[PDB]
Design a protein around this ligand. Structure first.
Ligand SMILES: [Zn+2]
Ligand SMILES: [Zn+2]
Length: 81
């Protein structure tokens, strides 16, 4: 599977939260979603760092099975529900 740019299939490096695209100079921020509850789950922040983990608001997941999706698109005013 790996992680590569949809444009330049080389190799994207993950620093946590965001994966950096080499050529393109693009940063892909990945958000931790559930397959059943498709939300930011619950915003856990520590020293600024953030992880999306629905503790009591839904139920915890092993981070090995959490859906880290690259959502850098405008979800505010157009992506309506
Ligand atoms: Zn690239
Ligand atoms: Zn959950």
């Amino acid at each position: 599977m790996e992680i590569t740019c949809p444009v330049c299939h080389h190799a994207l490096e993950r620093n946590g939260d965001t994966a950096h695209c080499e050529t393109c100079a693009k940063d892909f921020s990945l958000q931790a979603l559930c397959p059943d509850c498709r939300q930011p789950l619950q915003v856990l922040k520590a020293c600024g760092a953030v992880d999306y983990f629905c503790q009591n608001g839904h139920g915890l997941i092993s981070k090995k099975r959490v859906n880290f999706v690259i959502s850098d698109q405008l979800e505010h005013h157009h992506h309506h529900h």
